[PDB]
Every structure is written in C-alpha cells, then in structure tokens.
Amino acid sequence: MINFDTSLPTSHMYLGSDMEEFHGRTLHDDDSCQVIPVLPHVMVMLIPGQTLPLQLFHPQEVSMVRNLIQKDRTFAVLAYSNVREREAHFGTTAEIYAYREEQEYGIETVKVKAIGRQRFKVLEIRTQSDGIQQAKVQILPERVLPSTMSAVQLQSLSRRHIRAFRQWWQKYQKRKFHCASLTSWPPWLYSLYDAETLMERVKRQLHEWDENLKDESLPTNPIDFSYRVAACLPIDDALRIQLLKIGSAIQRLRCELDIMNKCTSLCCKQCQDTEITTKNEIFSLSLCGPMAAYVNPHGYIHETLTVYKACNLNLSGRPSTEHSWFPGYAWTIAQCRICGNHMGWKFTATKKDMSPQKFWGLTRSALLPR
C-alpha cells in the first residue's frame, strides 16, 4: 500500500506557504459578454475546477495581476487550436485564490494559485501596448438536464426512489427506467444517458488508479465530477478542446468513458511509435487525479501524469530535490531513448520507508495516446 500524502501535491508547497488567501467568489451570468485579461506566457488549457499554479516575473505580467487582485481576481486562459499562431476560439476563466508578492534579484515577482471557473467563447482578441492581451468573450452556460424519465412519468409510479450491490444497479435500471416501456427505447439505452450510471462507470476506473480512494473526496455533483475527470486524462490538445466545447455533464462523461476505453498505450509524440507507458501504469499520487498542472522555477507549466513503470526512458544528471512537486521525492530528467525528447522525470524517494519508492512524472505534451 501507498503511504505518501496525496494531499501534498494539490497544495503546491514548492510555491511556498504564507500566501494571501482570497475566499470571495465572482461568477458572471450565462451568455454574458465580458472583457478579461490574458496572461502572455500561459500556453496550457485550464478546465473548470482545475488548479493553475503560476510563477510570474515579467514586469507587464506582474503589474497586470497586481492590478487584478485590486478587483475581479479573474483572468482568461485560452484553449489554443494553434499554439504557434496563437489561435484560440475557446477558454476558461481563472480566479486567483492564493497570491504572494516578493522582491528579489532586482525584480518584482509574484506567485499565484488560481482555479478554473467558467468556460467561454472567444469573440475578439484585442492587444495592449504593454504586451498583455484582452479578450471579449461570451460565457458558456453549463447545461443541466433532468432525468430522461422526468417528462414521461407524471403518474403514480413516480414515487419509486433510487460485491452484492451489483444487483442493486440492475434493480436501479429496472426501477428508474421502468417507464421506458411508454417510449420507443429500452431501459438499457436510457442508462447510457443517466448521470448516476455514467458516473459509476467512470468511478470504476478512478478506483483502478486510486487504490486508497475514499468516496467522500469525490464530488457527488456530475458537473464537478465530469470536469475533475477531464483534467486528469492524458490526452492530446485536439481532444481536450473537444471536451471543453461540451456543455452537458452527460455528453462529457460519455466522451470521457469513450476516451478511457480506447486509451491503451502512451507513446513519444515525437517518435509516434516508441511506447513509453500504458493505461495500466497510471495511478493517482494526488487527490486531483493522476495528472495535474505544476510550475517550474521559470513559470513554465508542465501538466504531469504519475505512472509506476515507464519504458524507453533514459535519465541524465543526478537526482535533485530542488523545487520538487512531490515532497519527499527527488527528480531526475527523463528523455525518450530513441529521439531524446524530454518526457518528464523519474521521481525517487529520499527516505527508505516511503511508498512508492519510485514513480514517473510524464509531461502530457510529450505523450501521444497513438
């Protein structure tokens, strides 16, 4: 069994403690148009609910967020369709929750912890003199639907509420979707669109990654649950954007299950054919899931996936604990044996009593589900 504290990564300790905490929450109305600033050096995609750690040191980015704290505390994160040509039609708002100003080495520097809130549709990307952009965006509403059966049952059969509990799930289908008999579809079809059902089908793989998972931690709400799960799936940008367009939690879970089932082997994006790891090696070393966004000392955000065994990797240099994202572990650069592509790191425990004694931190940009 794993003894490592799965809460440690989620709290971004490497960023330092003693950060200004903000409680107050801002939420914009649905379909409303808003003008939100964009951070010039963020190139990652943020999912609602996902934590985004930042380490800003460019004077314009520093002044931007410094002024942001005085008001809204929200900024826009764009889902780039073409990162080189900086093209983005979608994005998510990020609200700052932890903040810290330091002055060092002749510069004014700031560290933030932000969280994804609301998805949006880009209308126009206007640019400012200082270099930082502004985005006229339209908030996309989260579309919540009732039970498939809600409409068909306005009757007496309505008052039928929701190992060994395998039969419970069949009795559940039999009971909940009994009124499918009034329709042109069977109860087993309706289950493919049931939020509770689709969640259990996902939770089935979430327990295969988190062996020591307590259901108390997991969100009951399908909206939060669909998003949490999206943020920890090691998939390409094209596929992540497609998931960000999704308005319904149902459509999302269905999409996520489809991905989860087709997901087999993870390759080197550069080689395309060199296999580095498999779905079976994936494990949740953090409560956020197997994958999370972390910042290096130069503000570069690496969404890293934790796996027990990796394969065509070669290491270089000696382990280091300096700025480690998993306290108690030392990192060492790992690259593709074939092409030399930076794949991530090998994390090795600094104490004999730690479980796991080693794991791999693979960056999702280096990977290809091919």
């Binding site: 009757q155 042109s184 493919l192 669109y193």
Partner: protein, 1091 residues
C-alpha cells in the same frame, strides 16, 4: 419555415380520476383527467352519464375536489405541469353549461430543482390550505383569489409521499422520507399565523426500506397507513400495527381508493393489474383488472379502473366469488390507444383511403389499433335487387310494434318483401300496386297504410288488407313529387300542390295552391312538440332555385332562400338535432345547404354549404342509439349528426349508397336497409363519430411496425415477459400473440429473475391473425424493423436490427441484421450479418440498406450472392438512434437532440457531413419534413423544426420552429387518414393516445392565422384563465421562450365554433389586403379537411 399542428385524435389515457359532488351536492360525480382534457360524469347506477367535456391550456398534475364551509356543491382544484393553479366551480342554467374560475394563479418558484418523486398536491380535510411539494426542501402553502402562496423550509430533502392528517386541532402532514441512514416516517405541524413548521404530534418512527405510499385514514382511527414492498404498517403515536402479507410480494402497490367514508375498506392496486381490499389489518385479493393508474369506488359495488397502459374499465365487486374465485367482473371497456410506441399509414380496404395501424399499450394490455376515418356498417343480409329507386319500412301487423315488411321502388315498378325473422321473401301487399313506381308508402293514422305512386294516393286498411280510399289529381295527371307523414300528405303535380289529411277510410283534400315554378322537392316533417301534425311545408323549386318555408294549410310563404346557381334542389328535409331545428337542402351537383329553422316564423338563419358527393344527395332520417340522425346517400355516403350544437358530417365506409331507410324487424333489430345500384344490404350502424378504432389485443408488448404489400401482412416486433423456471430456460406468464402463433419458429445461433423474450410477428392485413412468430435469440433485443427490396433483387424482405444485451455490458458489444423472406406462411432466413454493436435504426437508401451500429453509420449493398456488403462507414462520435432519409441525404439523431446531416456521394462512395447542431435536450422522435426542414419532439413535451452562403453558415442548422405541444411524441409518420392550401402531411403518435397532424404553410397564410390567433384569444374564455401564448411557450427547466413558426390548429378550428357576432369581432380589421368573415370561414373550413 411555417407549420400547422392540429389534434387528429384527442388523448385517450387516464392520468387521474376523482369522485365527489361537483355538479350538485346530490348527483355523484366522476371526474377523469385525460391530460389537457377534463371529462365530467354522473354515476347513473345503470351506467355513467357524461355531462360536459372541457379542455385546458395545461397538462393536469393535481386534481382534487373540496367543499370549504357553506358551499352549494364541490370546488375543483387543478394544478398544471407549468404550475397553473386554479379553483373551478360548476355552473348550469338550462342547456348552458360553463366551468367557472373561482381563483387562479401561477405557483412556480423563481428558482428551485423540481423534486424526484414529482408534484404532490394535498388538501387539509377542513379546507384550511393547499399543500404542494413541487421542489425538494420546501413546502408551498395556498390557504383556501389570486391564489397567494408561501414556503416553509423542510429539513428532510427527499420526501417520498405525503398526506394531510385527519382529526387535528392544528393542521398536520405525515410524510415518508429517506436519508443515508434509512427511510423513516415523520410528522410536522403547519401554522398559517406563524408561516412556519413546528414539531409533530408523534415520533419519527422507522419504516420499510421500500415504503412508498402514505394513506390518510379518517376518524375515529386517525393516523397513517404506510404501504411498502412486502409490509403494510400503521402509525398513531403509541398505536402501531405491522402486517406483511405474502400475496402483495409479487408487485408493488401503486394506487389506492377509499370504499367506506369512515376508513374501514380501501381498494389497493399493483403494477400487474391485481385488485386488493385492505380491511380495517387484513388484505384480500379481489381479482385482475387493467393496469390501473388510478382507482375509484362509486355507488354500490361498481369500480372505475383508470388505466394509462391499457383500456380503462368499469368493474363489479361481488361479495360472491365465481368458479375461478374472482370477486371482479368486467362491465364496460373504454378504448385507450396510449402509448403509441410505433405506427404506419396503409391503404387498406380501398386505395386513397388512409388507415393508421399503431403499436399501442404495454405488457398484458398490448394491442394493435386500427384507426380508420369514418363510420362503418355491419352487414347481416345481402340481396341481388339492382336499380332500387326507393326503400320503405312497414308494419303489416298493427298489434306488432316491429317492422315485418320492406317496400321497394323501381323504374315504373314496386316490389314488396316480407321479413319472417332472418328470412326475406318476395310477396304482394293487398291494396298496393306493383305496376307503378312508388314515391312513398308506410304506416299511417287510424291503423292504415298509404301508397303514393306516380298515378294516385292509395289508402289501405290493415284489418283486412283492402283499398279504403284513393285520391287522384282531377285531370288524371301524374304526381311528380310527394311528401307524407302520418296524418298529412302534400303532393306536387308540376307547379300544383295539394294538401290532404289521413282520416279513417278517407283521404281528405284540405287545400291546394299553384307555385311560381315547377316543384323539385317536398318535406312535411313535424318538428318540436307537434303531435304528428306539421304546420310547415318545406319546398324546393326549379328555375328560380329556391328553398321555401310554406304554412299549412294556407300554403302562405313564410321564407324564401335564394340558393343560387343553375343546379336545382333534389332533396329537402326539416330535422331536429340536440333540440335545435334545421333545414337541410341537397342540390343536384352534390352540394348540401344547411340552415337553422324557426318553427314559428319559418326563418332560415346561418346558411352553411358543405360539399358531399358528385351525385345528388338523398336525405333520410334514422334513429341511432336513441338519437335522430340524417343519412346522406351519394357516392360519398355521410351521417349528419350533432356535437356541441354544431352539425357534424362523418363519411360512411361504403363505395356508394343511393337509397336507405331504417328497419327494426324481429330478425333485424334497430337496423338500416341500404341500397346501391346492384344490391340491397341489411345491417347495423357503428358508433356515430369521426374515427373508428379496431382493437386487436396481443396480450404482450408491441414495439415496432411496418408493412409488406407483396405479402398482404404486417411485420411486428413484440416482447413478452417470462420468469426463470427450475430448468435451463424460462416459462411464460400467460398465453400471448408470440406463444399462440399459427406457425412458430426460432432463431438458429451462429454468433459468439424476469426475462424479456423478443419476437417478429407476421399479421394478416385483413383478419389480423398471428400467421407466424419468429422468436429471437436468448438475450437478443430486437430494435429496428424495415420491409423493403434491396439491390438488383426483386424480393421484398423483412429486415430486423438486433442487439445482444447482457447486464454487465453497458453498450451492446454485439448485434445482428437479419434478412427474412415471407413465403408459404413461414419466415425463411436469407442473411444473418453479425455487427460489433446495437442496430438502433435502419432505412432503405436508394436501393441500399443504411443501418446504425451504435456510434457508426453503415451502408450495405445487396449482392447476387444475397448477402449485405459493407460499403462506406461514417464514424459520428454520437450514438445514431435516429436515422431518417430523403434522396441522397441522411439525418442522424442522438437522444440529446444532437443532429448531424450526412450525404452519400455517388461518385466518391463516401459520406459527407453537411450540417451539425448540438443543443442538449432530450429528443424522443424526429422526421424529415422536406429537403431543407425537419421536425422533432424535444424534452418537456415540445416540438421543433430545424432548417438549412459562407461555409460556416451552410455547415450549421437553424432552429425555425418552437412549440409546446403538451404531449410526448414517440413516432412521426408521413401519411393522411383523409381521401393546394397546405404542403405535406406528418402524423404523430403520443404516450397519452393523442394523434396529431403537422402540415406546412406559406409566409402569408402563417401571418394571417397568427394574427387571427391573437384575436381569437381575446374572445375565447380559457378554463382556469391560462394564457394560450403561455401554454404554447417552449418550456424546459431553464428557458421558457414563446412559440415560433407554429399555428395551433385546435385554436384556429374553434373559429368555426364561436358566435357569428364574435367571428365579426375577430375578422374586424384582420387583413395589405382586406379579410372578409366569409373568406375566413372558407380558409378555416379548408384546414379542418386535412384531418
């Protein structure tokens, strides 16, 4: 896009029912909720008396009666699904009946998640308040004008059922609630003066894990009865009584009713159709009924079974059990088409005449329903007597009250038939002539018989048969036209008219006149409280073309209507429908004029024209089920009847009828002698209504239906429930269609505790008999069914789309496409194509077969080797449940209204995604209207229409129609039940049994009718005072947008029903081009013809 939506057949399914004294504190009433409809009744003790039938602008969710303190009768509370609350009072004054809104408002909360176990509408026994559980964690209270409401924060979120407790000084509610720890019963006291809740009279006692219903039991008992899966518990603080009968273990009790007003006897009802009696604790099984949605005890032993899955009932609760041991006997069965899960339009019987066969009902109530537009005749005798020019019934025996003689008229000839029971014989009536054509004959005054011929007027005595009197025109001229009742005769001799009275052994010439022109037709029918003596003579004339009301005996003109035209009136008739007097005048061209007649003044008002046949119509009166009717004989035989003091015309399903008369003989009771060009038929008339419904019980669930003309049979997918037996298989619950097949067969496998068995049934298009039944594989779920010819092959095959369903599998990993040939009364299996998924839908595509295997859309080619060959595959990322086609363009549909248009490229042999839409909402059905438009059924009982320069513009669909239907559509179908103003016709089948019609309109016609709708709404009084515009507003938990691109046919049709001064109000400044009231009558008349 502009569309028109109208009800072809109202909802049939019973949503709820109650008993009380609504009409009067004397009369026992039964109120039935058929969704948007309210049926009000009186318990006749010798039947069920229908008083009034009102329609509402909402789906009924709550319906409970109440009498608060000093009231003349009962007040009805109605709550719609859109939270329209209202109090309705009954108001009668003579012939006028009106529902009166006593209080009305909308109780919807600005926010809130509608609860899981639906809307609960309970009333305090003392009529102190209205309790509503619409949202989880709140309790809405309406104290019993604008229906003022307030909420009370309820701590226990998940409430199962609740009732208002009896015998309380302070109002109390008892509810079953569920929390993670368990499911427990609780009590709360509701205070109006404190506007909050206070602790209940007794403790939160723990109940059964599956405790479903709370039964409010009256004094001297008090407290509550909690019904569960196996247990029936009772709670009253310290008083507790827990019974667990094994007889209720099989099915869950879904509905109850109170038999004794004190609370000693209750009628319980389970999901399988069993009827229980809870005695005060002891439970006794009475017998089996239809699957009851609701139960009502009324009068002495009679029970109303309010069913939604099958035909509603009237049943007797005898204290004496029969041989089988049942204390339940079936009195009357009320047709319920709902749910319609599938349907198709077929040209059965006659071509051009559309008939609608539906997969209706569920489980044991499963049936096929054949809906044919028009009344039918049940033939009992057929005689070869060509060229009959007239028919008349007679009673040769004055002592006998029934007809024993039938007199036939021919070209210058008369024959007489005697009815010796079922035996018809050629005979001669003494006194009557055979050598002259007859214009009239029948039983007359002073126990005599009359015969009017082209020559004379002969009066014949009945004891014995002999000639008593004989009238002739002075110059021996021929009688042209003739009218006779019982004591009076008016005959024409060209322009001349003669009035004679029928006295004992005497035909008395009272008066005579000359007319302006030649007489074409005559009528002297006595109307009102006129004892066989008519003071009016209705007459049609040649050349001037007029209908004239003359006075008897003076012959003085009272009114003269100028019919207009060159075509002369052929038939004229004075009649009485629903106590209202009318004049009916048929023309040679087939046109029928109808007016209301004043018996005193003789004034013809409200002139209405109706086109019947191409031939001159002959009007004969007949009594059907103690009601006067008019049979209109032409090449389109019609019945002219009354409904809500408006004349209705429904076609008779007969090629042509020339002459008819009613015959009540010992062998043919309450019958109709009908004659055409070749034969005389004696038979009985069906129910006088617009549509006819033939019920073919299957005793199992019909799911899908299609037709094969080349086989003269229907292919039907049906499933039966079977329980797991103590053997390596299953056993049936009762015999049903699939078990009782003429020839039976089973699928042979090649692919790698209550069970659902799937079958393909083969039913003959006439008899409707199960010729064959092909049972599918174990765990095989049949989904789609299509009858077509594919590739170069000239044989029509029945194709079935299956899915291998297992409880562990979520998405079916296996499935088949099975090709069957129906020849020699057996299904020959041509091809068994195994696919890696569920075959949700299939369609014939320009000579190929398009099918959907889960999320993929496959195109199959039918080779010479007679095997479907995979051509091109479109991978959609959306499950392809809906698959519809028109030419080379395909429509793909997801349950979440995710539509995508495909197009097969003939030269490329691939699929091209034209346009896509992704607006999450539950979608139940979808149809292609035309090349650019397509109709669908969206969540919260709504309808919608999606329509088709830049690439971004053309690749995205536009929602052009939004409409709240109030019904859950399961099937769309291109067809019509009727033998240009509008474009196309799509019929739709709903869950409640409602059938509807959707057609297309022009920009101008749409706006004309939309303007008219707003105007009609300013006149028309709404039950519960609900705004029409609100009721039709597109509605979901989120957005409530007003209706667009849709015209409510049901509202537009009620223009022909409003008062003429109100029509004038509606048409005033309507329109630019001006709009005449007579123009808008023609437009609206034209639109009523589509259905």
């Amino acid at each position: 896009s502009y569309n028109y939506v109208v009800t072809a057949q109202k909802p049939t399914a019973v949503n709820g029912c109650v008993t009380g004294h609504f009409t009067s504190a004397e009369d026992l009433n039964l109120l039935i909720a058929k969704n948007t409809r309210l049926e009000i009744y009186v318990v006749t003790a010798e039947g069920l008396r229908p008083v009034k039938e009102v329609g509402m602008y909402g789906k009924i969710a709550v319906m409970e009666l109440f009498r608060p303190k000093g009231e003349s009768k009962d007040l009805l509370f109605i709550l719609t699904a859109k939270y329209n609350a209202c109090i309705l009072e009954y108001k009668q004054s003579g012939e006028s009946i009106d529902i009166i809104t006593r209080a009305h408002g909308n109780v919807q909360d600005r926010i809130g998640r509608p609860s899981e176990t639906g809307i609960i509408g309970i009333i305090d026994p003392e009529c102190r308040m209205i309790g509503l559980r619409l949202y989880d964690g709140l309790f809405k209270v309406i104290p019993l004008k604008e229906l003022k409401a307030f909420n009370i924060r309820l701590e226990e979120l998940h409430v199962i059922d609740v009732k208002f407790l009896y015998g309380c000084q302070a109002p109390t509610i008892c509810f079953v609630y569920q929390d993670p720890q368990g499911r427990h019963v609780k009590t709360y006291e509701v205070s109006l003066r404190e506007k909050e809740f206070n602790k209940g009279p007794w403790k939160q006692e723990n109940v059964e894990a599956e405790a479903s219903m709370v039964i409010a039991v009256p004094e001297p008992f008090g407290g509550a009865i909690i019904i569960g899966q196996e247990s029936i518990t009772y709670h009253n603080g310290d008083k507790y009584l827990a019974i667990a009968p094994p007889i209720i273990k099989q099915s869950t009790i879904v509905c109850h009713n109170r038999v004794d007003p004190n609370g000693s006897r209750y009628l319980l009802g389970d999901m399988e159709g069993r009827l229980f009696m809870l005695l005060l604790l002891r439970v006794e099984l009475l017998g089996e009924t239809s699957i009851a949605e609701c139960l009502t005890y009324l009068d002495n032993g009679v029970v109303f079974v309010g069913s939604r899955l099958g035909d509603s009932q009237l049943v007797k609760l005898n204290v004496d059990s029969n041989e089988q041991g049942s204390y339940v006997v079936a009195m009357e069965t009320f047709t319920n088409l709902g749910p319609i899960v599938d349907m198709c339009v077929v040209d059965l019987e006659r071509q051009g005449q559309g008939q609608l066969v539906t997969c209706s009902g569920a489980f044991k109530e499963g049936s096929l329903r054949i809906i044919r537009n028009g009344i039918g005749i049940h033939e009992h005798a057929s005689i070869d007597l060509p060229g009959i020019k007239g028919l008349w019934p007679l009673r040769s025996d004055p002592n006998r009250e029934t007809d024993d003689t039938l007199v036939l008229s021919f070209v210058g000839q008369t024959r007489v038939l005697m009815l010796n029971g079922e035996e018809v014989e050629e005979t001669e009536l003494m006194g009557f002539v055979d050598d002259q054509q007859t214009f009239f004959c029948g039983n007359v005054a002073h126990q005599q018989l009359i015969q009017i011929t082209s020559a004379s007027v002969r009066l014949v005595s009945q004891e014995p048969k002999a000639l008593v009197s004989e009238w002739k025109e002075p110059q021996a001229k021929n009688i042209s036209v003739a009218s006779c009742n019982s004591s009076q005769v008016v005959v024409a001799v060209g322009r001349a008219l003669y009035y004679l009275q029928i006295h004992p052994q005497e035909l008395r010439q009272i008066s005579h006149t000359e007319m302006e022109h030649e007489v074409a037709c005559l009528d002297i029918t006595p109307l009102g409280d006129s004892n066989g003596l008519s003071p009016l003579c209705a007459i049609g004339l040649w050349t001037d073309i007029s209908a004239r009301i003359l006075k008897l005996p003076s012959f003085e003109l009272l009114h003269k209507e100028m019919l207009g035209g060159e075509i002369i009136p052929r038939s004229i008739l004075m009649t009485t429908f629903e106590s209202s007097h009318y004049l009916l005048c048929a023309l040679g061209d087939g046109a029928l004029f109808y007016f209301g007649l004043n018996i005193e003044t003789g004034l013809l008002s409200d002139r209405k024209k109706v086109t019947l046949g191409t031939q001159p119509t002959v009007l004969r009166t007949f009594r059907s089920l103690s009601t006067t009717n008019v049979f209109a004989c032409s090449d389109r035989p019609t019945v002219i009847y009354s409904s809500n003091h408006k004349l209705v015309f429904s076609n008779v399903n007969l090629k042509e009828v020339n002459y008819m008369c009613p015959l009540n003989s010992d062998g043919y009771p309450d019958s109709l002698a009908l004659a055409n060009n070749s034969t005389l038929t004696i038979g009985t008339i069906d129910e006088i209504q617009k549509l006819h419904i033939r019920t073919v019980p299957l005793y199992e669930s019909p799911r899908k239906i299609c037709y094969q003309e080349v086989s003269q049979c229907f292919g039907v997918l049906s499933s039966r429930i079977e329980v797991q037996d103590t053997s390596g298989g299953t056993t049936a619950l009762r015999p049903s269609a699939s078990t009782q097949a003429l020839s039976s067969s089973v699928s042979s496998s090649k692919l790698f505790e209550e069970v659902e068995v799937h079958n393909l049934l083969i039913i003959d298009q006439h008899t409707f008999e199960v010729l064959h039944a092909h049972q599918f594989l174990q765990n095989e779920y049949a989904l789609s069914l299509v009858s077509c010819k594919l590739g170069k092959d000239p044989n029509t095959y029945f194709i079935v789309g299956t899915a291998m369903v297992y409880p562990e599998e979520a998405e079916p990993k296996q499935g088949r496409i099975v090709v069957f040939q129906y020849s020699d009364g057996k299904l020959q299996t041509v091809a068994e194509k195994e696919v890696k998924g569920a075959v949700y839908s299939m369609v014939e595509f320009n000579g190929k077969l398009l099918a959907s295997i889960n999320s993929t859309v496959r195109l199959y080619e039918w080779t010479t080797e007679k095997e479907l060959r995979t051509e091109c595959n479109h991978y959609n990322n959306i499950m392809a449940l809906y698959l519809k086609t028109k030419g080379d363009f395909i429509l793909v549909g997801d349950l979440m209204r995710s539509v995508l248009l495909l197009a097969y490229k003939p030269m490329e042999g691939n699929f091209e995604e034209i346009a896509r839409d992704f607006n999450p909402n539950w979608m139940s059905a979808v149809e292609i209207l035309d090349d650019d438009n397509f109709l669908g059924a969206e969540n919260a009982f709504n309808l919608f229409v999606c329509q088709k320069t830049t690439d971004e513009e053309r690749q995205h669909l536009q929602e052009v129609g939004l409409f709240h239907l109030g019904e859950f559509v399961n099937v769309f179908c291109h067809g019509s039940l009727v033998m240009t103003p509008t474009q196309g016709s799509v019929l739709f089948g709903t869950v409640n049994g409602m059938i509807g019609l959707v057609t297309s309109l022009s920009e101008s016609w749409y706006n004309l009718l939309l303007d008219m709708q707003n105007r009609l709404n300013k006149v028309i009084k709404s039950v519960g005072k609900i705004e029409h515009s609100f009721w039709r507003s597109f509605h979901t938990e989120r957005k409530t947008e007003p209706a667009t691109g849709f015209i409510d046919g049901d509202l537009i049709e009620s223009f022909l029903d409003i008062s003429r001064p109100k029509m004038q109000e509606v048409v005033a400044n309507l329109q630019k081009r001006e709009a005449t009231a007579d123009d808008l009558i023609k437009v609206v008349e034209e639109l009523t013809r589509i259905h």
